[PDB]
Structure 1
Amino acid sequence: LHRNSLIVLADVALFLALYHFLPFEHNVVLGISMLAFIAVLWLTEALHVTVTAILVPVMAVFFGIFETQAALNNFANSIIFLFLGGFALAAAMHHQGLDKVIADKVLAMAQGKMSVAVFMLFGVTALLSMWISNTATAAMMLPLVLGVLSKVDADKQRSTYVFVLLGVAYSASIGGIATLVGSPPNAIAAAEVGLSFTDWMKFGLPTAMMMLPMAIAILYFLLKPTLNGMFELDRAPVNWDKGKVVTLGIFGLTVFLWIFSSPINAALGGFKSFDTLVALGAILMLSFARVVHWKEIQKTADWGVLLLFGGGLCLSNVLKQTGTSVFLANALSDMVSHMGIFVVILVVATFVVFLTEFASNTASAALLIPVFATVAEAFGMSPVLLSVLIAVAASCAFMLPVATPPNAIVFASGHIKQSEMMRVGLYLNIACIGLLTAIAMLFWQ
């Protein structure tokens, strides 16, 4: 009776159809049919992203592709735990309120100027997003933005207070491209191609550094009248209490080890997934240092995303084991050789940057990273490029709301028009397809 119940039944139909009608070796048929089935369920979101994730192994198992335990073992990949470490690290500094103090201390550095208020509001939202979340960084920023844009209250003077709203919802999404913790897509790429924390930063941090100015520039040079206004610094000030310095200290130490993981680990006996150990170490230090309780981490952690990671890896393995990766490689063989590597990575970048407007950031990564990385491997090319690309572009949702929660958070502020966002994002999309295809060409040799 419901929309989604039908999408599911139409997908069950589609599967059954593809299954019986495709004219290939049995494994490829099964692999293709499953790919389509999942593809639909993640893009439509007829079932919850995480329920679909769980659907992957239970199919794999019933269709004899894997044994139950083999399939499940995916959900215990070391990146999954690295991400759970980053969740606990966030939980700590939120419960501790170290996110508020980093906001106040930087925001009140700007004395009383709306010019240097919004510019510091974007610079914080981005720096906080590197470690925290997107949905979380955005929802935490909204009250602090509405606090500032209350002195220039005239909402017949909209474009002042739309620039600073749309500004953070993008700064949250762009800041999420800086490190391996931040936005799930990054983690899905890292789990797929086997990246370290310090690996993904060598890619993303440059891209975030480039894209934040470029995005502010584009919002600016549409309609900004904000070189005017004054501050209302209205609320109780902040102060470092029972080891907000400790939470910072652990955080600093953790982030330090993540960066210097390569020499530190090598000069320790070369442990296997060092970054993950550092991440689990963080959870231990944070608990021994009494600084955060476990009930907190259990609330903060998006276990649904952690389960998603696994289902996506399971999918990747279903494609390999059924030879569907090799089959598509053969099928695209003539096409990709008739295209350039420029042409390809332009098509890819474009495709996702717009697909991510209609569907979930991570759901899109969870579908496309496996398909592309595994096909790239059948071509015997390093799957890293295509994977990192997809993950960055999947976090480039700038048009409508519903694209990301950050977009829909500043939108519910009952002010910003549907039409307005749809055209700043349309420029910023292309702007990125440029920047990405640009950078993706430079990171080659």
Structure 2
Amino acid sequence: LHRNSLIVLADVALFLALYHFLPFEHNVVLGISMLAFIAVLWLTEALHVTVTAILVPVMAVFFGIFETQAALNNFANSIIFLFLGGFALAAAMHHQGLDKVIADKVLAMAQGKMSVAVFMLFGVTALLSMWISNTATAAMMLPLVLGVLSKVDADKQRSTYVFVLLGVAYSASIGGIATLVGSPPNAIAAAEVGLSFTDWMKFGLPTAMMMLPMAIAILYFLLKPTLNGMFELDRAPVNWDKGKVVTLGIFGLTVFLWIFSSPINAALGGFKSFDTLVALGAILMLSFARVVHWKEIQKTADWGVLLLFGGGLCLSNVLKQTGTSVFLANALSDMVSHMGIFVVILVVATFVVFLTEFASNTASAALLIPVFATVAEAFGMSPVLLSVLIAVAASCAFMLPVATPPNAIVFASGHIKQSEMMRVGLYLNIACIGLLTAIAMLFWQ
């Protein structure tokens, strides 16, 4: 007796209508009907996206596509455990106060001036969300801006809060674009096409360090904050201790292995998923050093996202087995030939941004990469390009906080203006699309 339940029932009706009123082959029609069913559920949020991910194997099995174990085996792909290692590092830092220490040392780097402390905050948020996550990285940095701006006349000068708030909220999202960890869509792209950490970083890091300064510029030239005073916090300086240095060293070692995985993996025997093995080894070393415990890790890690990966992967395998992907590519050849690759990528990224406005970034990614990339497999036209393009565009979200939990946390202070944030996000969306397409045209050809 709820709109969500009505959505599910109408969605079942659409599934049946497609099943019995489509003049295609049995496997392709089945896959298209499943894709529509799951698409509506993920976009409309009638059920939780994790629950829909759990539903994908069940309907896949009951239609005789996969065996139960084969369908469920996509919930233990190596990328899932890679993100698990990322969450473990996050738990270690939040448990040891290392993120607070990093912010305090940065803020000691800036003597007392706001005009650059915010910039170092954005940069630190990028470097930190690169390896961890977005929502976590926003939570601890919000109290900092409140303390810094507690003496700035918060009744007529609120754009300064808005700058030092949205810059962090978007810096985390852009920091997720440089490394596989930090943003679930990037993992999904790597999962479908097959990607190493270093190669994906060569594709992502330039985009991150070029997108982020642009976004900061957009805000600064749109809204005009002061950034001319001085701040003098009253809080005490936290200093180094055992555990903090050890987990810092483990973090550096893990990054070093993830970067030089190809030579190391070649020397050690050439294992298939050395990045994931490094993630698990990081968990083992943290447990060995007793810097964190599994209950912290269990409380911190979002297992719903890890199951949503399984949903996306099972959907991709379903579309691959059923032939829907090649059927779609063959039907879309005429459109992709008439319209150049330039306009093709413009419409794809534009559609992604308008899609995550009224949807979840990760759910939309898990819906989209299996379609276009498998389509791009048949086309030729390296699907790594489209996969990363969609994955990065998913992280670029600048809409009403219901779209994005980071925006929810940062909005929750309760003084930011709805319409102003919409217009700011509009300009940011436009700039991201243009810059992304320029990168793909010039660098990736």
Shorter chain as denominator, the TM-score bin is over 0.9
C-alpha separation between the residues in 1 aligned to 2:116 and 2:218?
18
Give the match for residue 220 of structure 1.
220
Q: Deviations over 1:38-78 (max 9, x none)?
A: 01111111110100001111111000011111101111111
C-alpha separation between the residues in 1 aligned to 2:339 and 2:227?
47
Task: Identify the range of structure 1 (213-222 vs 224-233) with the bigger mean alpha-carbon deviation.
Answer: 224-233
For 1:414, what is the secondary structure of its paired residue? coil
The answer to whether the 8 Å contact 1:398/1:428 transfers is yes
The answer to whether the 8 Å contact 1:104/1:238 transfers is yes
Give the match for residue 387 of structure 1.
387
Cα displacement (A) at 1:117: 2.0
The answer to whether the 8 Å contact 1:122/1:168 transfers is yes
Cα displacement (A) at 1:362: 0.3
C-alpha separation between the residues in 2 aligned to 1:281 and 1:443?
35
C-alpha separation between the residues in 2 aligned to 1:85 and 1:168?
24
The answer to whether the 8 Å contact 1:42/1:363 transfers is yes
C-alpha separation between the residues in 1 aligned to 2:282 and 2:132?
14
Cα displacement (A) at 1:404: 1.1
The answer to whether the 8 Å contact 2:163/2:225 transfers is no
The answer to whether the 8 Å contact 1:152/1:229 transfers is no
C-alpha separation between the residues in 2 aligned to 1:144 and 1:157?
18
Q: Deviations over 1:66-110 (max 9, x none)?
A: 111110111111111111111111111111111110111002211
Point out where structure 1 has 5 or more consecutive residues left out of the alignment.
none
Give the match for residue 174 of structure 1.
174
For 1:177, what is the secondary structure of its paired residue? coil
C-alpha separation between the residues in 1 aligned to 2:153 and 2:318?
55
Task: Identify the range of structure 1 (261-270 vs 233-242) with the bigger mean alpha-carbon deviation.
Answer: 233-242
**Against the structure 1 CA distance between its residues 66 and 417, is the aligned structure 2 distance closer, same or farther, given a 3 Å change threshold?**
same
C-alpha separation between the residues in 2 aligned to 1:100 and 1:203?
31
Task: Identify the range of structure 1 (65-74 vs 197-206) with the bigger mean alpha-carbon deviation.
Answer: 197-206
Cα displacement (A) at 1:219: 0.4
Give the match for residue 366 of structure 2.
366
TM-score, structure 2 as length reference? 0.98
Point out where structure 2 has 5 or more consecutive residues left out of the alignment.
none
C-alpha separation between the residues in 2 aligned to 1:265 and 1:379?
32
C-alpha separation between the residues in 2 aligned to 1:154 and 1:246?
41
Task: Identify the range of structure 1 (176-185 vs 220-229) with the bigger mean alpha-carbon deviation.
Answer: 220-229
The reply to whether residue 415 of structure 1 matches residue 415 of structure 2 is yes
The answer to whether the 8 Å contact 1:85/1:282 transfers is yes
Cα displacement (A) at 1:428: 0.7
Cα displacement (A) at 1:230: 2.0
Task: Identify the range of structure 1 (361-370 vs 5-14) with the bigger mean alpha-carbon deviation.
Answer: 5-14
Runs (4+) of structure 1 exceeding 4 A deviation are none
Cα displacement (A) at 1:296: 0.8
Q: Deviations over 1:2-22 (max 9, x none)?
A: 121111111111111111111
Alignment of 1:306-321 (within 5 A): 306-321=306-321
Cα displacement (A) at 1:214: 0.1
C-alpha separation between the residues in 1 aligned to 2:234 and 2:19?
63
Cα displacement (A) at 1:233: 1.5
Task: Identify the range of structure 1 (97-106 vs 14-23) with the bigger mean alpha-carbon deviation.
Answer: 14-23
Q: Deviations over 1:110-169 (max 9, x none)?
A: 111121221222122222211221111112211111111112133311112211111111
Cα displacement (A) at 1:329: 0.9
C-alpha separation between the residues in 1 aligned to 2:125 and 2:35?
37
Query: Paired residues, what number?
Result: 445
The answer to whether the 8 Å contact 1:61/1:68 transfers is yes
The answer to whether the 8 Å contact 1:173/1:396 transfers is yes
The answer to whether the 8 Å contact 1:108/1:233 transfers is no
Q: Deviations over 1:327-354 (max 9, x none)?
A: 1112111111111111111111111122
Cα displacement (A) at 1:301: 0.8
Q: Deviations over 1:177-216 (max 9, x none)?
A: 1211101011111111111121221111111100110000
Give the match for residue 274 of structure 1.
274
Q: Deviations over 1:230-274 (max 9, x none)?
A: 213132321111221100011110000000001111122111111
C-alpha separation between the residues in 2 aligned to 1:359 and 1:234?
41
Task: Identify the range of structure 1 (51-60 vs 227-236) with the bigger mean alpha-carbon deviation.
Answer: 227-236
For 1:108, what is the secondary structure of its paired residue? helix
Task: Identify the range of structure 1 (246-255 vs 151-160) with the bigger mean alpha-carbon deviation.
Answer: 151-160
The answer to whether the 8 Å contact 1:121/1:145 transfers is no
Q: Deviations over 1:414-438 (max 9, x none)?
A: 1111101101110110101011101
The answer to whether the 8 Å contact 2:131/2:179 transfers is yes
Percent identity (aligned): 100
C-alpha separation between the residues in 1 aligned to 2:59 and 2:232?
57
For 2:94, what is the secondary structure of its paired residue? helix
C-alpha separation between the residues in 2 aligned to 1:364 and 1:351?
11
Cα displacement (A) at 1:293: 0.6
